[PDB]
């Protein structure tokens with residue numbers, strides 16, 4: 001039993017809700033919140049911009065030190081950093097950004113990072129401003145993640161479309 005509330009159960013391990021991931025993380029304080037990151041951990045917009053803003057830019061400060069030490073992530077890769085005031089940890093995961101011409105096949109690799117964590121609050125990878133089809137991203141999430149994932153979707157029309165189209 002966990003403290004995630006109001007989710008629709010899609011499969012044995014995947015749950016979905018129309019919600020703002022920032023407001024969800026503040027309420028639940030999950031062990032892990034997933035950020036929709038880029039390789040440079042530059043948290044400018046989308047989920048990344050919103051999560052970083054909620055940390056008062058502490059996420060960005062920590063991320064800049066991470067990059068200065070380690071260099072960029074790989075597309076499909078991840079790193080674990082602090083969750084600041086939002087969660088215990090933030091798993092920064094880089095899905096392919098179709099608006100950069102990146103290979104959508106790497107979306108499965110991106111979701112594989114979730115399997116290293118027993119429970120996660122997460123967005124749909126490569127959705128929103130990353131330019132991928134969210135229906136496909138959900139398909140890949142369900143077919144790749146085996147640990148317990150709570151997917152937040154703030155856009156209602158999208159959420160309703162995702163539920164109503166789910167196979």
Ligand SMILES: OC[C@H](Cc1ccc(O)cc1)Nc1ncnc2[nH]ccc12
Pocket residue numbers: 019020021022036046047050123124125126127128129152153154155158
């Ligand atoms: O897949 C990630 C989606 C993409 C998206 C953006 C705009 C839309 O209208 C529909 C989808 N972004 C988010 N998902 C959950 N919480 C969020 N908080 C801030 C952004 C954000």
Ligand SMILES: [Cl-]
Pocket residue numbers: 045046047127128129130
């Ligand atoms: Cl977005």
